[PDB]
Amino acid sequence: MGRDEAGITGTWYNQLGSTFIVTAGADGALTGTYESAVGNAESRYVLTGRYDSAPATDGSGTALGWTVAWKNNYRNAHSATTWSGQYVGGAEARINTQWLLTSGTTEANAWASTLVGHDTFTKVK
Amino acid sequence: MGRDEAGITGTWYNQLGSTFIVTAGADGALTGTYESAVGNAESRYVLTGRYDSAPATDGSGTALGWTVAWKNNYRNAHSATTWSGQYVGGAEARINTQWLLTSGTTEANAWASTLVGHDTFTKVK
Amino acid sequence: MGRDEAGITGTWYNQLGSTFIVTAGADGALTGTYESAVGNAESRYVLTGRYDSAPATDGSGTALGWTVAWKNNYRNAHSATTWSGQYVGGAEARINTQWLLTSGTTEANAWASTLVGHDTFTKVK
Amino acid sequence: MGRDEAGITGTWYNQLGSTFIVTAGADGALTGTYESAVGNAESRYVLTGRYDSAPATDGSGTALGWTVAWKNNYRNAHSATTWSGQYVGGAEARINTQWLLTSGTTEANAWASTLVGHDTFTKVK
């Protein structure tokens, strides 16, 4: 029943070679796994998030976000990334994001706790 | 079994007067509701996220994040915010975040799709 | 005498079709003009910034930034963008940035004052 | 002749204990020095930037930004910070910023090149 439930659900790849597998729920849920090609990461990590299940019908994209905390059975990078973005449908469907990666730090080092970047996900490559 | 499962779970308030109610799961889950005191928002919205359930024991904070998509039974703001941050425990416990708020836009307006800010959550006020 | 003084100075174009003309000084200065292909902007606007005039020699990029306040003789958009990034030299030289665009706002609307994005500049197109 | 030329020019202090000394020009220029209380920094560093010299008269703040590249005669941190923000005048005048700190990196590590934060400057402390 979600407008882009079908368009969003599946396997996505970003420009770093990371893989995001996601299921979109009718109501707005996102659940899945993430495997990063870079950084202090091995194998899959749990992800959860939310998307707008009833987007505007004027050619606008579909807002969404999700989170990964970088702990699984293999490693713990004491950090979490959140991606905020929009899904755009069609023959070259994309999810265009910006992300914030916060590490656990001492209060002294907190100023330097957060990295910022941008990932573009596609259904190919 | 999560290290800050107890410290995180509950009701938090930010500097805008918004209210975040969250349950932390032993494994890393965050689930809850968010009510914003500002913007195109009314009542509670679903939130989901992840936290590091086994943080460093050296006085570092606990990395976490979560997402709200701004649709509920009342309104649809065609947008989603993700908060990335760290929980710091103790008598003045805090969750210090930065956030990204993406709106669904046309490809023409996509450059201007994302707001960035910072929220500090406390257990009082 | 600046290491990338020569590589940086000139005309650059981003993915939106904007044009950045810059002179790099030996000491670290950047001065120039910016013309945005989008938004509340017409013609050229003054820019100033700074770059690292003695970068690492290990294949690392060259950190830099600059600012435009969106006032000139034609328009005043009551806003300023800052680009932070790195210059990478070679046959496909690039300046890879992230940017923050702050508008003047009332204290009530300050939460929503700042847009964030990413621009990639090239010497062609 | 700049509206907040007088309000902006002077010495400012942020929550980390850093010191920003700035002169505002009638036309929009900002020039000065910055001394960071944290990070890979010693003594003063050159800063340059721009502000809106004719802000809205409706109680809105005054948009501005500036850049520091972290090289001076003492150290070179192969990095640059840009602050984007707004000046708010009155008895408790403030400059409320967000900042992007980019390091020069290899193309492999570029994903992790940029830190993001927020500084609040005041005329006291």
Instruction: Name, in order, each residue with C-beta under 8 angstroms of C78's C-beta and a sequence gap of 6 or more.
Output: C70, C71, C103, C104, D52, D55, D56, D60, D63
In angstroms, the Cα distances linking B76 to A56, A71, B44, D49 are 9, 33, 12, 39
Using an 8 Å Cβ cutoff, are B68 and B46 in contact?
yes
Provide the token pair at A44: 């899959």
Domain holding B37: CATH number? 2.40.128.30
Residue among D53, D72, D73, D71 nearest D63 (CA): D53
> For residue D21, what are the β-bridge partners?
D11, D33
Q: How many CB atoms lie within 10 A of CB C38?
A: 13
Using an 8 Å Cβ cutoff, are A59 and A50 in contact?
no
> For residue A35, what are the β-bridge partners?
A19
Residue with tokens 């969003």: A8
Instruction: Tell me C61's DSSP state.
Output: -
> For residue D86, what are the β-bridge partners?
D63, D96
Name the phi and psi angles at C57, rounded to 5: -105, 20
Cβ-nearest to D104 among C28, C60, C78: C60
3-class DSSP assignment, residue D7: helix
**CA-CA distance, A120 to A110, in Å (whole number)?**
28
DSSP string of D19-46? Answer: EEEEEE-TTSEEEEEEE-SSSS--S-EE
Q: Is A66 annotated as a binding residue?
A: no
Provide the token pair at C64: 């830099």
**CA-CA distance, A9 to A28, in Å (whole number)?**
12
Rounded to a whole number of angstroms, the CA Rg of chain D reads 15
Residue with tokens 């904007």: C18
Q: Where are the beta strands (DSSP E) in B25-73?
A: 29-35, 45-51, 62-71
Q: Is the Cα torsion angle B97, B62, B49, B31 positive or negative in sign?
A: negative
> How does B48-83 read in b/e, with b if 16+ C-beta sit within 10 Å?
bbbbbbebbeeebbbbbbbbbbbbbeeebbbbbbbb
Residue with tokens 């990095």: D79
Using an 8 Å Cβ cutoff, are C40 and C51 in contact?
no
> For residue D19, what are the β-bridge partners?
D13, D35
Experiment used for this model: X-ray
Identify the residue among A50, A71, A81 best suited for mutation to test binding to B, counting B beta carbons within 10 A and taking the highest.
A50
Q: Which amino acid is at A90?
A: G
Chain C residues with at least one Cβ partner in B under 8 Å: 16, 38-39, 100-101, 108, 111-112, 114-117
Provide the token pair at C80: 């300023």
Q: Is D34 annotated as a binding residue?
A: yes
For residue A48, what is the nearest residue in chain B, using CA coordinates? B49
Using an 8 Å Cβ cutoff, are A5 and A53 in contact?
yes
Q: How many CB atoms lie within 10 A of CB C41?
A: 20
Using an 8 Å Cβ cutoff, are B74 and B42 in contact?
yes
**Count of pairs with CB atoms under 8 A, one residue in A, one in D:** 32
Instruction: Name, in order, each residue with C-beta under 8 angstroms of A91's C-beta and a sequence gap of 6 or more.
Output: none
Provide the token pair at A79: 């950090």
DSSP element (H, E) containing B9: none
Instruction: Tell me D3's DSSP state.
Output: T
Q: How many CB atoms lie within 10 A of CB A11?
A: 12
> For residue B34, what are the β-bridge partners?
B20, B45
Instruction: Tell me C109's DSSP state.
Output: G
3-class DSSP assignment, residue C7: helix
Provide the token pair at A71: 């702990």
Q: Which amino acid is at B11?
A: T
Distance from chain centroid for Cα C35: 11
Provide the token pair at D14: 């942020």
Contact between chains at A111 and D100 (C-beta distance less than 8 A): no
Q: Which residues of D touch A111 (CB under 8 A)?
A: 16, 38-39, 117
Please list the alpha-helical segments (H only) found in B4-124.
5-8
What range defines the domain where residue D5 resides?
1-125
Distance from chain centroid for Cα D7: 15
Residue among A64, A96, C117 nearest B80 (CA): A64
Using an 8 Å Cβ cutoff, are C46 and C68 in contact?
yes
This structure's resolution (Å) is 1.7
Based on the structure, what is the number of domains in chain D?
A: 1
**CA-CA distance, D118 to D122, in Å (whole number)?**
13
Contact between chains at B114 and A98 (C-beta distance less than 8 A): yes
**CA-CA distance, C56 to D120, in Å (whole number)?**
31
Using an 8 Å Cβ cutoff, are B12 and B121 in contact?
yes
Could you tell me how many helices (H) and strands (E) chain C has, helices first? 1, 8
Residue among A107, A53, A62 nearest A85 (CA): A62
Q: Is D99 annotated as a binding residue?
A: yes
Q: Which amino acid is at A41?
A: A
Q: Which amino acid is at B73?
A: N
Q: Where are the beta strands (DSSP E) in A7-125?
A: 10-13, 19-24, 29-35, 45-51, 62-71, 76-88, 94-103, 114-122
Using an 8 Å Cβ cutoff, are B80 and B67 in contact?
yes
Q: Is D12 annotated as a binding residue?
A: no
Residue among C74, C76, C49 nearest C63 (CA): C49
Provide the token pair at C101: 């665009």
